[PDB]
Short mmCIF file of C-alpha atoms in Angstrom, two decimals:
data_model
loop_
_atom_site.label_atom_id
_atom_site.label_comp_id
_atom_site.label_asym_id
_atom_site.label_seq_id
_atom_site.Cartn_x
_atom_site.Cartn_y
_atom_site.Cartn_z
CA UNK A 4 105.54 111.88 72.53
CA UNK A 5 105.36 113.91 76.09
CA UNK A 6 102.45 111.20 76.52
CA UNK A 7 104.90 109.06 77.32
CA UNK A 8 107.67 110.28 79.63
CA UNK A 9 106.81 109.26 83.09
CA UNK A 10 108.71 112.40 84.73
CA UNK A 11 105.99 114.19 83.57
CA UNK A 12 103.47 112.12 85.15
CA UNK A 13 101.47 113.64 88.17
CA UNK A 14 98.60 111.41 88.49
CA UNK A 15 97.95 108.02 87.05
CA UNK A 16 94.24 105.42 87.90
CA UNK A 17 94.96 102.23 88.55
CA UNK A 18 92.43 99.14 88.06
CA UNK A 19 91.99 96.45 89.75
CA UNK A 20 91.02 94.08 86.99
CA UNK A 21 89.57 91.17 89.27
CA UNK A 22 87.18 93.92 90.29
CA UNK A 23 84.71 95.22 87.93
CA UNK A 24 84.55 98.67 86.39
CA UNK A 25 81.34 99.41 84.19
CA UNK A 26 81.72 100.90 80.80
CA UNK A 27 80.52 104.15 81.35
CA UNK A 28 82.72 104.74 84.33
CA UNK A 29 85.94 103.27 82.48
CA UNK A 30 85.34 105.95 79.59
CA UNK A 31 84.83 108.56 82.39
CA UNK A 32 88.46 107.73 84.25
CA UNK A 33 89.58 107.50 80.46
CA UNK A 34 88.98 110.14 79.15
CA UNK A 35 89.98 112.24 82.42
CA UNK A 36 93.34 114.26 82.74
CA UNK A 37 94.90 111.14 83.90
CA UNK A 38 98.68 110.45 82.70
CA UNK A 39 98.04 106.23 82.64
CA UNK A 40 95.93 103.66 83.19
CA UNK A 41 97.31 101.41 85.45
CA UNK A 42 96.53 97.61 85.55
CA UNK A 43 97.69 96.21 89.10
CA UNK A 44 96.02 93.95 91.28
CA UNK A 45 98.88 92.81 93.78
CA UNK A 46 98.35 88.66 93.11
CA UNK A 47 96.61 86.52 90.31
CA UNK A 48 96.13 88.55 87.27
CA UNK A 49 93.11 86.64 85.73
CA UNK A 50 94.50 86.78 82.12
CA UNK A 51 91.01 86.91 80.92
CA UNK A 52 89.77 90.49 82.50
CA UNK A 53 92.96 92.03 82.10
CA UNK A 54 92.78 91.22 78.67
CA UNK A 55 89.36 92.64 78.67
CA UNK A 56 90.10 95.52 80.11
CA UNK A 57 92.82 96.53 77.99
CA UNK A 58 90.91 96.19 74.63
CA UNK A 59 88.40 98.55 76.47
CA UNK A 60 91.39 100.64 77.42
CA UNK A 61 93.17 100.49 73.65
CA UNK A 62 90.42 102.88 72.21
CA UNK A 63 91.57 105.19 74.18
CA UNK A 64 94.93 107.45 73.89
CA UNK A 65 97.05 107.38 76.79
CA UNK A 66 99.43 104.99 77.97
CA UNK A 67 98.49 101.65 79.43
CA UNK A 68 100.33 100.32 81.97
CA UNK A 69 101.19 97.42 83.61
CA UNK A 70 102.39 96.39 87.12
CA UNK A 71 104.02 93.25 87.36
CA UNK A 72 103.44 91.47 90.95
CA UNK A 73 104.24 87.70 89.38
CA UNK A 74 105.48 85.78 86.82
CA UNK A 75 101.92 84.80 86.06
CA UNK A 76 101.25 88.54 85.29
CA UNK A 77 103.41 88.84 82.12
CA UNK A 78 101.46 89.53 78.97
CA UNK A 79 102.29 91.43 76.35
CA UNK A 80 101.14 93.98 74.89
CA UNK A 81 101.39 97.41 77.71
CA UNK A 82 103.33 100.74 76.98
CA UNK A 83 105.11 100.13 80.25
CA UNK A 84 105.69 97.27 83.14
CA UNK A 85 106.68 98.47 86.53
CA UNK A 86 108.22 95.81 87.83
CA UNK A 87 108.66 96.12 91.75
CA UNK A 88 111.39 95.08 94.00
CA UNK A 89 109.69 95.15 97.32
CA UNK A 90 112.73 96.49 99.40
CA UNK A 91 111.58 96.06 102.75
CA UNK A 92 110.06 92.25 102.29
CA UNK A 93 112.21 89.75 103.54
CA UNK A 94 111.98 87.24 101.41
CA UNK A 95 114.48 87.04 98.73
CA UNK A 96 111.78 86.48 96.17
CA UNK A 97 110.19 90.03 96.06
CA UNK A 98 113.85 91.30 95.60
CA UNK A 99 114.92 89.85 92.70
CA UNK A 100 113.91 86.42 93.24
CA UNK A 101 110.83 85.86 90.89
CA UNK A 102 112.38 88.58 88.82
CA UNK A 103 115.23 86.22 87.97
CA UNK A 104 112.43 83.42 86.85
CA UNK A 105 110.63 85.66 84.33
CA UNK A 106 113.91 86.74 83.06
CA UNK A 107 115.21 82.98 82.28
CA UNK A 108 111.45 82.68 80.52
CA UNK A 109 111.55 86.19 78.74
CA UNK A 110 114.80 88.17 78.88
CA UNK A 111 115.32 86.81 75.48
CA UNK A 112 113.09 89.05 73.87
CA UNK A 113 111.82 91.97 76.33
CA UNK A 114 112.21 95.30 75.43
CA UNK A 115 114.07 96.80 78.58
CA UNK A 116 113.11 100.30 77.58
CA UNK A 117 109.78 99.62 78.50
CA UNK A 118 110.28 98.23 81.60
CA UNK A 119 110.80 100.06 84.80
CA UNK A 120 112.58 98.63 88.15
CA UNK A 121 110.33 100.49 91.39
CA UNK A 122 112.11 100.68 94.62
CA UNK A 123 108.58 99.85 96.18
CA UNK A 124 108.43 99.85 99.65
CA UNK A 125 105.30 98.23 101.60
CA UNK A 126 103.90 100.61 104.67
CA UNK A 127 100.67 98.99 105.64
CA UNK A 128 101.13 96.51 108.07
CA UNK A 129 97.76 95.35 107.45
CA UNK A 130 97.43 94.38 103.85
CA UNK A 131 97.02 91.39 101.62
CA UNK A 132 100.83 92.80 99.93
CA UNK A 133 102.13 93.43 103.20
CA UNK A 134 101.35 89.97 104.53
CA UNK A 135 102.26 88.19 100.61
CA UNK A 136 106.22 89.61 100.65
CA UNK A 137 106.71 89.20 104.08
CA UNK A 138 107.37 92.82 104.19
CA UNK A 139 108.72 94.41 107.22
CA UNK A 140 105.96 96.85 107.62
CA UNK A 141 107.79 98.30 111.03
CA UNK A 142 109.40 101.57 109.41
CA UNK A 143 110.54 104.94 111.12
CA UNK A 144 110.79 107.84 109.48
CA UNK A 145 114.67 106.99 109.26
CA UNK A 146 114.05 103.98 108.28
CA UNK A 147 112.20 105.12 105.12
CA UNK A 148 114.83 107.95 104.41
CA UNK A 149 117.78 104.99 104.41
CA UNK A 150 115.41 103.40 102.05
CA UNK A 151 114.89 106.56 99.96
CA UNK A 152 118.67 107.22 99.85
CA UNK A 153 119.25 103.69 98.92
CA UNK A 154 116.71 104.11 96.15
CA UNK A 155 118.74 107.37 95.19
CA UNK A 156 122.00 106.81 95.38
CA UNK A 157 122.67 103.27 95.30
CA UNK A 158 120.28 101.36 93.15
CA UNK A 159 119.78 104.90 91.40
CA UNK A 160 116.33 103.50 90.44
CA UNK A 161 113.89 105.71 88.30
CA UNK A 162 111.22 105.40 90.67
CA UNK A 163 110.78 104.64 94.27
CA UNK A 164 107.33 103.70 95.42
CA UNK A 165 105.55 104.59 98.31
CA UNK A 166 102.16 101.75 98.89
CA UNK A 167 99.77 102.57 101.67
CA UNK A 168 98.01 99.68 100.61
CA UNK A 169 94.81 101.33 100.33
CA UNK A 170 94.81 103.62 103.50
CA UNK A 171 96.01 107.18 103.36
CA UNK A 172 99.48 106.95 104.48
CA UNK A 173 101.59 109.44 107.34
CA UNK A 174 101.91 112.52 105.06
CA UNK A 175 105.09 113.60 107.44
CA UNK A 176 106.76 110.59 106.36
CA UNK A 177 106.33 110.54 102.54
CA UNK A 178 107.73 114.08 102.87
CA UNK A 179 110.69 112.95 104.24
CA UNK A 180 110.75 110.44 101.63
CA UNK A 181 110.73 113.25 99.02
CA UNK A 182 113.56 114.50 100.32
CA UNK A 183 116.14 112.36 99.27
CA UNK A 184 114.94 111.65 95.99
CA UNK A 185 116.55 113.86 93.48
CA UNK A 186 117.24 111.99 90.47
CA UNK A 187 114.61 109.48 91.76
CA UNK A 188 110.60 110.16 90.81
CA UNK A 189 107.91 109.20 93.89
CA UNK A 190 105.02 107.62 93.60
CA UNK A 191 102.85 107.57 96.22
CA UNK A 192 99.91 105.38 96.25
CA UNK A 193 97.32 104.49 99.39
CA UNK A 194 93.91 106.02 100.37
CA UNK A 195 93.36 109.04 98.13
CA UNK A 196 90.13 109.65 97.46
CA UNK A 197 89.18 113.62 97.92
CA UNK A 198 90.24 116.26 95.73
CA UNK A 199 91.81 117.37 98.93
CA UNK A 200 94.19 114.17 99.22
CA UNK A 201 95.12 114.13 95.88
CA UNK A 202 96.25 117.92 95.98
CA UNK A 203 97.94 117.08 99.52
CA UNK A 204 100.16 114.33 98.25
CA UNK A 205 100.47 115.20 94.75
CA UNK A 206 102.29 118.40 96.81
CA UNK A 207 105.10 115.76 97.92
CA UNK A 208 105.42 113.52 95.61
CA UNK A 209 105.60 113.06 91.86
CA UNK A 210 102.77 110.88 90.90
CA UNK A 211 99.96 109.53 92.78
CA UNK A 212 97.96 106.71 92.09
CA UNK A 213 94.37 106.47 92.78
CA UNK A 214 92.42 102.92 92.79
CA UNK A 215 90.09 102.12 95.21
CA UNK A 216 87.52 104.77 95.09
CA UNK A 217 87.18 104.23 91.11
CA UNK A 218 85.11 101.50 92.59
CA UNK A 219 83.38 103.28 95.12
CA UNK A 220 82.69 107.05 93.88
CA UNK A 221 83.21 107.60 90.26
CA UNK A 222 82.35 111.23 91.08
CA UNK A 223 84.97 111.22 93.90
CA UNK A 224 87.56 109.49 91.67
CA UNK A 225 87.68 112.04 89.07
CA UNK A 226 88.44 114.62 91.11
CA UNK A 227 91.84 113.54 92.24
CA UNK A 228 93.01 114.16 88.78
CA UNK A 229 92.16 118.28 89.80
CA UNK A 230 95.60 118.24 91.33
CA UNK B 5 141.95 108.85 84.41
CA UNK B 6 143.69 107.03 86.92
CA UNK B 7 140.27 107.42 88.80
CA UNK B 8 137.70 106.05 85.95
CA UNK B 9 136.87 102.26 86.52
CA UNK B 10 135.86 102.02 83.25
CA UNK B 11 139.24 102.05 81.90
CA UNK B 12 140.99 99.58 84.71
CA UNK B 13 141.81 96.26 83.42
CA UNK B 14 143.65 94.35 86.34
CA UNK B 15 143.06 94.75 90.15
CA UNK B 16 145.35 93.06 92.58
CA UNK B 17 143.11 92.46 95.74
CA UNK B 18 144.74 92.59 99.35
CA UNK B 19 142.98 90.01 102.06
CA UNK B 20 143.94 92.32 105.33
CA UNK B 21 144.30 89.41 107.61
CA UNK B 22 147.10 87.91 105.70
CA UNK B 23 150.47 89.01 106.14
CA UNK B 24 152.63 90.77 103.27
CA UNK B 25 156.07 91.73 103.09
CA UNK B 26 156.94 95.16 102.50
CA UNK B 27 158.92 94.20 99.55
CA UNK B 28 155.99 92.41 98.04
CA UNK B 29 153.95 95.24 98.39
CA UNK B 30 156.00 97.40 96.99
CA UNK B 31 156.52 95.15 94.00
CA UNK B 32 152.36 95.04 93.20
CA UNK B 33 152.15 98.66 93.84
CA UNK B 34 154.92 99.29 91.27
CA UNK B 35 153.28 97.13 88.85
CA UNK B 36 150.83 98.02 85.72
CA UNK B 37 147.95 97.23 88.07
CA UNK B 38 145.31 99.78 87.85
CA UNK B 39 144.42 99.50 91.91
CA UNK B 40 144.90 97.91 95.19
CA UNK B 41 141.63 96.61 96.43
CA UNK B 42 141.78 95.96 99.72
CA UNK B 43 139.17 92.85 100.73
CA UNK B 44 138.46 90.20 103.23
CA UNK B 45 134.66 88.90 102.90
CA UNK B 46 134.90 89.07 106.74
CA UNK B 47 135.01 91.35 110.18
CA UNK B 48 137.98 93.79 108.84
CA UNK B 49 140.80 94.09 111.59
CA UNK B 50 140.37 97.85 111.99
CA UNK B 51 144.04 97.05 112.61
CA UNK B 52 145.83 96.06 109.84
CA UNK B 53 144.10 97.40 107.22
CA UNK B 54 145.50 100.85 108.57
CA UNK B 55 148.83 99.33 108.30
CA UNK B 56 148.78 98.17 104.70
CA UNK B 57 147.00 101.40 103.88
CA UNK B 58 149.88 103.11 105.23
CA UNK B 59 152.47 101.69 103.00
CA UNK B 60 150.10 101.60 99.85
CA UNK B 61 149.62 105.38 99.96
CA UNK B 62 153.07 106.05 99.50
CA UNK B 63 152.42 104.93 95.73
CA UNK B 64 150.19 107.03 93.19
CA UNK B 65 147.72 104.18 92.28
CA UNK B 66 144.12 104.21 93.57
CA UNK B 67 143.36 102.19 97.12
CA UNK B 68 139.77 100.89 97.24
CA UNK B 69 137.90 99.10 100.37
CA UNK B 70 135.55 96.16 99.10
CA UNK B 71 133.21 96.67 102.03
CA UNK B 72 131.65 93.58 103.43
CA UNK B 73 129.88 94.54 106.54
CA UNK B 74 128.72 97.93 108.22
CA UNK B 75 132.27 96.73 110.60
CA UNK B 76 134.56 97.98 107.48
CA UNK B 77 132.99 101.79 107.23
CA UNK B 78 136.32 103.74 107.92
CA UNK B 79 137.83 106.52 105.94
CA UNK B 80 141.00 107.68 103.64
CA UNK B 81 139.69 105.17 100.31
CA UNK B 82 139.34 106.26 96.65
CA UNK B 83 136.28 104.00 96.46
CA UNK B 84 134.13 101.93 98.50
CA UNK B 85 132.87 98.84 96.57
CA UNK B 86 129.68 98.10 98.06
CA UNK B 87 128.11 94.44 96.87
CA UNK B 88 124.81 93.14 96.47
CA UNK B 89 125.09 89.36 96.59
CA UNK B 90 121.92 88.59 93.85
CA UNK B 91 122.36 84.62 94.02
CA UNK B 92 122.27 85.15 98.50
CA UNK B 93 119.06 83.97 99.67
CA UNK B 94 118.86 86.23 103.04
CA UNK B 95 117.51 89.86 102.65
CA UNK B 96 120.46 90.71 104.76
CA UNK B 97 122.80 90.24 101.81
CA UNK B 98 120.63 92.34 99.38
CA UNK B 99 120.23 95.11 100.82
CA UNK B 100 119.66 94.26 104.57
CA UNK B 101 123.16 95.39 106.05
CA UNK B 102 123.10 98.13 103.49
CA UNK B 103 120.01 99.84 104.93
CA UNK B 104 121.75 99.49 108.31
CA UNK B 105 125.16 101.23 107.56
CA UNK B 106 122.68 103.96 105.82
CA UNK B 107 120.77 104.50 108.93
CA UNK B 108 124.37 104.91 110.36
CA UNK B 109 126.11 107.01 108.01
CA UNK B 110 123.71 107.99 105.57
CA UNK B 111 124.42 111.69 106.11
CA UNK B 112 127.92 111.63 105.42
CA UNK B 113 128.63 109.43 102.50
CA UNK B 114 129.99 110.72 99.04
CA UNK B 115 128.03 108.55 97.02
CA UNK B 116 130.14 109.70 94.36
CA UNK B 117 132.85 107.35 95.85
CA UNK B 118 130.42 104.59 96.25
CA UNK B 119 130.15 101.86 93.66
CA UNK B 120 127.43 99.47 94.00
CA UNK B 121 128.44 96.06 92.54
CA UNK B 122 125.75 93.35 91.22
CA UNK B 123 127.65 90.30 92.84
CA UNK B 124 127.00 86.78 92.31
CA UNK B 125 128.71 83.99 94.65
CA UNK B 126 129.54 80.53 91.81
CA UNK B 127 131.72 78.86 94.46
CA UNK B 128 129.84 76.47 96.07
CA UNK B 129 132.39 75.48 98.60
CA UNK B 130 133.67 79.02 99.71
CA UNK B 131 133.19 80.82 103.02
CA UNK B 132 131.52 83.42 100.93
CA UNK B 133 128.66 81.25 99.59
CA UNK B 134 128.15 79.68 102.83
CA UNK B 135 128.05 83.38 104.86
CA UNK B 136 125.55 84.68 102.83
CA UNK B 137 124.02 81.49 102.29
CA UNK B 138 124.23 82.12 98.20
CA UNK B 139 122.63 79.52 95.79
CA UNK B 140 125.42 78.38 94.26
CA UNK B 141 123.80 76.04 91.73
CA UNK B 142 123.47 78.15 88.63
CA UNK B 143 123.01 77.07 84.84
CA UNK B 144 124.38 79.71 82.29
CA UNK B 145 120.51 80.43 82.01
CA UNK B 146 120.79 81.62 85.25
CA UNK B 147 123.46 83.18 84.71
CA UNK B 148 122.30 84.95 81.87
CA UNK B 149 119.14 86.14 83.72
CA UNK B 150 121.78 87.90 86.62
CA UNK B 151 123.59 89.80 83.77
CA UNK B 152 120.61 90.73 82.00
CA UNK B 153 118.82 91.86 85.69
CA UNK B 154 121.87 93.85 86.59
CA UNK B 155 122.62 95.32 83.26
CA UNK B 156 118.81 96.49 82.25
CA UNK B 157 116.91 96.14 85.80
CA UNK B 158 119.22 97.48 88.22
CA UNK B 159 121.59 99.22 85.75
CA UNK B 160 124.64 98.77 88.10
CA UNK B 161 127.69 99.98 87.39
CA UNK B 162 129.47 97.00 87.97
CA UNK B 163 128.35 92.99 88.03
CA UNK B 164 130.92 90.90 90.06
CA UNK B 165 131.71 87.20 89.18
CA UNK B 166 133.11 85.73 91.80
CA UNK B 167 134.25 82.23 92.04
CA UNK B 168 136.16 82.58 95.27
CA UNK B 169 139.31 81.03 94.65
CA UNK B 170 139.13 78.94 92.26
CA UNK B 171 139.21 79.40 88.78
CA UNK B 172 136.02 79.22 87.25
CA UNK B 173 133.83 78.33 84.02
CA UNK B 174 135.12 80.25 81.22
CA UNK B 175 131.94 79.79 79.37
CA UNK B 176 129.60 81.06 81.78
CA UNK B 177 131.69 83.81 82.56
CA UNK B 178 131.40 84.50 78.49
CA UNK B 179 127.85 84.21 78.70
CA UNK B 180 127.25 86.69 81.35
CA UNK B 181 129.48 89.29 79.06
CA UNK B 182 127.36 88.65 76.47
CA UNK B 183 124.78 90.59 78.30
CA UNK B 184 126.55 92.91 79.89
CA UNK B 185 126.33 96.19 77.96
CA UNK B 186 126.53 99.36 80.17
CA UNK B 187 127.61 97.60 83.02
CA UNK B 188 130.93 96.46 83.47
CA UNK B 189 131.97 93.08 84.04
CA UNK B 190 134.58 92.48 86.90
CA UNK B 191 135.67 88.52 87.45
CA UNK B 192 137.96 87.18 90.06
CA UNK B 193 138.70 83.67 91.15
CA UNK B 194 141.83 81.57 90.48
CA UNK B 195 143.88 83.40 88.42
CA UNK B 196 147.53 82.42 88.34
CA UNK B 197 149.09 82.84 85.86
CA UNK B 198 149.65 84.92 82.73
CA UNK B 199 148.05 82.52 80.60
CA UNK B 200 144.55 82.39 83.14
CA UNK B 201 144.89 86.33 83.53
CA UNK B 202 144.77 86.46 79.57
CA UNK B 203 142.14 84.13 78.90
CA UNK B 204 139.36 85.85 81.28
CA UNK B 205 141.14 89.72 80.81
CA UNK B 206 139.54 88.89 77.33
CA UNK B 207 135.92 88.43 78.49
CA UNK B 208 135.61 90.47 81.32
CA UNK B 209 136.85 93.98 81.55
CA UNK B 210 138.57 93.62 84.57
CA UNK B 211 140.20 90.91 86.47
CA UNK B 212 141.23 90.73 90.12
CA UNK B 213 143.75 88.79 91.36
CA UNK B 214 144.21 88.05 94.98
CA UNK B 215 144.99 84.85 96.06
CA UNK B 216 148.01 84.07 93.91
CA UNK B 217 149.69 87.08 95.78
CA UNK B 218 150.69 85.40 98.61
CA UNK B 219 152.09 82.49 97.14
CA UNK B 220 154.32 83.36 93.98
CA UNK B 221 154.69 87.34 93.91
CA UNK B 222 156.18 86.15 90.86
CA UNK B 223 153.30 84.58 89.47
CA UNK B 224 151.03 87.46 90.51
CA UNK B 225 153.11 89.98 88.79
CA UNK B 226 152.73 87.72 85.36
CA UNK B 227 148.72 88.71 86.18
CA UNK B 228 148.87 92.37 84.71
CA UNK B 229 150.54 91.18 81.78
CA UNK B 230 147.55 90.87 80.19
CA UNK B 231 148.46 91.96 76.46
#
C-alpha cells in the first residue's frame, strides 16, 4: 500500500465541493497521476455535495482525503483528515481551540492513524482564510523560517503547510521554508496553474496542491500533475 | 540513563526567587530525586539562578530550566522545558513567545535538549492561570480531549498537569493518564507529603515537588519516597 504513504506524495487536486465539478472532468482529475483527492473548502462543508462528491470519488482508486477547517466538517468515511492548526492566526481557536471541541464529540472513537496535525500557516493577506483565523498574514522570510523550525523541531509535526490562498505565493520564501524541514514534509498550496508552476514548486516542496484551475481549465489542471 | 526522562519518577522544582539554604540544597541534591528543575512562571533573576546553579552542579544529577519567557534563554542546562499552555486563551502562550525566542536564537539551539511540554493550567486562582489568562474551568471531558490532543495530535513528549500549588483532583489527573500513551504524564501541585507523593507517583509518571521545599525540607525529602 505505497498508495497510501503521504511521503511519497508529490502532487495531490483538491475540490472545492461547494463549487461544481462536472462528471467528465472529475473522471479526468481522477484518473490523472494525482496522489489524492482532496476535499477542502476552508468554511461550511455542505454535507450534502461532499457526500456527493465522494461517492463519485469512491469508484475510483486513490486515496480520498479530507481537510478539516470545522467541527461541522467531520464525516466519516475519508482515508485521511488533515486537520490544521493555523499557527500564525491569533485566535486561540484555529490552534487547538475547535480542535479540543471535536475531540470531546469524537476522540472516543477516531482512528488517530488516519488523522494528520498540519502546521498550516496562512500567507495571503487577502483571503476569505486569512480574514476567518485572524491570521497574522504580516510574515518575513524569518518569520516563516521560525515557523518552519517550530514545525520541525518543536511540534515535530508530519507536515507543515504553506496556503497562498489561491495566488501563487513568493517562491524565495517557500524555499526558505524547505529548508528547515527535515523530518517535516511541505505542502505548498496557492496559484498553480501551468505545468510550469507546478514543476517550479513541486522543485521546493514535497507536495503541491492544485484547486482552483480544476474549475477554470481542465486542460490546464492536468498538467500540473507533469511534475 | 541519568539523562532519559522517560525513566525519572520525582523532580524537586527550585522557584529562583526564593531563598534556600545551602544545607537544604545539598540535602535535595543528595536525595533519590531524578533532577533539579529550576522554575519560576515569571521574569527569571538572571541573578540568582546563576547562584543556585552554581551549587547544584557540584552534584551529579541533571539541572533543567523550565523556561517561561524568551527573558530565561541562558546557557549551562541539561534540558530546557519549553511549555505550551493548551487551556491559555492568548496566542502568545501557544506558541506566540515561542516564535519570538526562535527568531532570536533559532540558529543556535540543540533541539535535542529541548523538550516541548503540552501544559494545561487547573488552578483557577494561581498567578499562572491569570498570566496566561488560561481557562481554568475544565470537566474531565475536557480534560480528556487535552490528553488525547497532546498524545495523538501533537504527539508531545511530555503533557504537564499543573495545579499550581495546590493539590489537585486525583480523578482527573487519572483520567488524563488514561489517554496518555506515548506521551508522558508529568503532574505537580501540592504535594506534601509521602502519602500525596505516592498517591499521584502512581498515576502520573513523574511528580514534581516544589513548594513543600521551602517549608519542611523534611517533608520534601518524604516526596521521593515514592515506593
Amino acid at each position: 500500500g505505497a498508495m497510501y504513504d503521504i511521503k511519497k506524495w508529490r502532487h495531490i487536486f483538491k475540490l472545492d465541493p461547494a463549487k461544481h465539478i462536472s462528471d467528465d472532468d472529475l473522471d479526468a482529475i481522477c484518473m490523472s497521476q494525482t496522489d489524492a483527492i482532496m476535499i477542502g473548502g476552508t468554511d461550511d462543508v455542505t454535507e450534502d455535495n461532499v457526500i456527493h462528491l465522494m461517492s463519485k470519488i469512491r469508484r475510483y482508486p486513490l486515496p480520498l482525503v479530507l481537510e478539516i477547517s470545522n467541527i461541522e466538517s467531520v464525516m466519516p468515511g475519508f482515508d485521511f483528515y488533515f486537520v490544521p492548526t493555523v499557527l500564525n492566526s491569533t485566535d486561540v481557536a484555529f490552534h487547538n481551540g475547535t480542535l479540543l471541541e471535536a475531540l470531546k464529540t469524537y476522540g472516543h472513537s477516531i482512528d488517530f492513524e488516519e488523522v494528520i496535525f498540519e502546521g498550516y500557516v496562512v500567507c495571503n493577506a487577502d483571503s476569505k482564510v486569512a480574514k476567518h483565523t485572524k491570521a497574522n498574514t504580516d510574515l518575513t522570510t524569518e518569520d516563516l523560517e521560525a515557523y518552519a523550525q517550530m514545525v520541525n523541531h518543536m511540534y515535530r509535526l508530519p507536515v507543515m503547510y504553506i496556503e497562498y490562498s489561491g495566488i501563487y505565493g513568493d517562491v524565495s520564501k517557500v524555499q526558505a521554508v524547505s529548508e528547515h524541514l527535515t523530518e517535516t514534509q511541505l505542502f505548498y498550496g496557492g496559484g498553480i496553474s501551468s505545468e510550469q508552476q507546478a514543476t517550479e514548486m513541486a522543485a521546493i516542496a514535497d507536495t503541491i496542491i492544485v484547486g482552483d484551475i480544476i474549475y477554470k481549465d481542465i486542460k490546464k489542471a492536468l498538467k500540473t500533475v507533469k511534475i
